[PDB]
Amino acid sequence: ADYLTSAKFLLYLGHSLSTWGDRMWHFAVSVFLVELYGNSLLLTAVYGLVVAGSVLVLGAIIGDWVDKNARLKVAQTSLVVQNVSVILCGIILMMVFLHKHELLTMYHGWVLTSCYILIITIANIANLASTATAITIQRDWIVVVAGEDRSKLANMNATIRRIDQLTNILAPMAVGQIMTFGSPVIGCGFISGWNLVSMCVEYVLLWKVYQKTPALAVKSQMAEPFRTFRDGWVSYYNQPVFLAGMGLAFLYMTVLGFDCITTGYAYTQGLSGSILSILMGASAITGIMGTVAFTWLRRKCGLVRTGLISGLAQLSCLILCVISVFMPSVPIISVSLLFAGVIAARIGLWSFDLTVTQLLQENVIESERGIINGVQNSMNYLLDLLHFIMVILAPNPEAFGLLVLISVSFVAMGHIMYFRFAQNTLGNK
Numbered sequence: 195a196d197y198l199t200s201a202k203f204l205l206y207l208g209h210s211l212s213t214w215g216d217r218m219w220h221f222a223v224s225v226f227l228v229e230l231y232g233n234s235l236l237l238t239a240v241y242g243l244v245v246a247g248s249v250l251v252l253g254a255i256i257g258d259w260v261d262k263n264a265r266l267k268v269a270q271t272s273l274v275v276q277n278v279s280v281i282l283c284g285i286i287l288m289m290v291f292l293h294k295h296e297l298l299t300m301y302h303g304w305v306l307t308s309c310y311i312l313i314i315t316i317a318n319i320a321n322l323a324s325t326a327t328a329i330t331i332q333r334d335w336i337v338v339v340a341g342e343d344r345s346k347l348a349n350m351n352a353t354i355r356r357i358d359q360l361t362n363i364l365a366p367m368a369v370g371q372i373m374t375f376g377s378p379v380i381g382c383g384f385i386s387g388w389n390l391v392s393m394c395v396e397y398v399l400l401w402k403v404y405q406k407t408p409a410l411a412v413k414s415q416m417a418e419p420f421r422t423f424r425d426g427w428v429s430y431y432n433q434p435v436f437l438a439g440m441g442l443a444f445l446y447m448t449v450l451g452f453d454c455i456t457t458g459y460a461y462t463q464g465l466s467g468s469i470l471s472i473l474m475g476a477s478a479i480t481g482i483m484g485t486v487a488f489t490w491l492r493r494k495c496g497l498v499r500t501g502l503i504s505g506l507a508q509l510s511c512l513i514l515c516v517i518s519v520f521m522p523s524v525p526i527i528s529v530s531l532l533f534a535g536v537i538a539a540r541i542g543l544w545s546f547d548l549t550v551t552q553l554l555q556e557n558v559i560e561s562e563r564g565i566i567n568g569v570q571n572s573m574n575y576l577l578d579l580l581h582f583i584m585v586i587l588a589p590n591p592e593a594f595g596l597l598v599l600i601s602v603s604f605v606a607m608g609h610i611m612y613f614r615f616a617q618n619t620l621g622n623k
């Protein structure tokens with residue numbers, strides 16, 4: 195089987211072994227914050243606000259970094275930084291858990307706060323490196339490797355999204371089984387070793403994939419970074435794909451996902467391990483269905499029409515969701531219907547994100563694949579930070595109707611901007 199040694203599968207394996215470690219470490223840090231500190235939302239909110247702004251700035255700066263340096267060296271350095279940061283965070287977490295009872299009492303609260311700050315800073319560096327790697331792989335190496343064959347590019351993006359989704363719903367399950375079967379102290383260390391092994395194998399894998407395809411080779415102190423930062427954003431406006439980016443960012447700011455806040459809505463109305471597993475499995479299955487639907491629609495239509503159709507479907511079932519909210523024992527109809535609306539919204543959302551990311555891949559000048567995508571991630575996290583602020587503005591279980599109304603309104607605005615883009619770049623239906 196020459197497929198195993200082929201470049202496409204090498205890149206698939208590289209991204210799979212990267213995202214598995216990423217998701218496992220995210221789950222580990224979230225569980226650490228939940229377990230060590232009884233209060234989390236306040237802190238997890240601090241984590242969100244220190245990740246989002248740092249990404250907002252250093253992501254444009256990284257987009258400057260990606261296109262400037264060597265193609266392979268930048269990716270290797272990104273992998274090194276991400277895995278080393280995760281290693282340091284794991285070591286600090288192991289030292290904290292081992293001395294859980296030795297600093298809550300004997301040491302001053304400043305020591306615990308300093309440990310939390312060190313974890314926050316190192317995890318922020320890790321996530322910044324993860325964003326750098328995501329850019330340099332997905333938005334540049336996929337385009338180069340897939341080449342002019344647009345269908346191959348679409349299939350590669352769909353496959354990467356499918357493995358991302360399956361890993362996103364499997365990694366928490368495996369880590370929870372590990373922690374329950376073993377111990378939080380022992381299981382946490384397993385992540386450090388797994389990330390080190392993945393570091394070595396991923397370094398080898400990237401070195402290999404670079405050799406398989408030669409096309410990849412062809413290509414006071416704060417004044418300069420802001421020269422690029424000012425240049426990077428204004429470059430985004432000049433590009434014809436700006437409205438698509440804005441629409442994707444507005445969709446990115448969306449409460450009606452299945453993250454911690456919808457998990458808390460579940461705590462309030464209905465919540466169980468079986469229910470969580472069933473809902474997340476349905477979400478993953480429907481995301482896979484959305485990816486395959488995106489591929490099918492791209493086979494039938496082009497790209498902009500596919501994005502328009504996916505947005506219409508997502509907005510339709512979010513209209514169904516807001517109908518469910520509108521309609522007043524336990525209202526089992528309302529919560530289950532809201533979840534079904536979220537599931538179909540995930541279908542449409544994955545389709546739309548694939549469309550927009552492919553358009554950003556195929557409609558950007560060669561030398562600015564780094565800055566433009568870095569700014570697009572910066573904007574995504576800008577509106578994600580606004581989402582976090584809206585969450586902490588009304589962190590009340592019965593203050594969720596307004597939040598969901600705002601989320602659906604922002605989805606509508608994003609799809610309106612995408613329709614404006616379709617009209618701008620296409621004069622026919």
Ligand SMILES: O=C(NCc1ncccc1F)c1coc(CCNCCc2nc3ccccc3[nH]2)n1
Pocket residue numbers: 241242245246445446447448450451452453543544547578
């Ligand atoms: O609704 C969802 N996502 C919109 C969306 N995303 C991506 C593509 C299309 C699309 F439409 C949704 C649901 O689950 C998830 C998976 C988690 N990502 C959340 C983004 C995030 N991760 C963070 C980590 C640290 C700090 C801030 C962070 N912000 N994403």
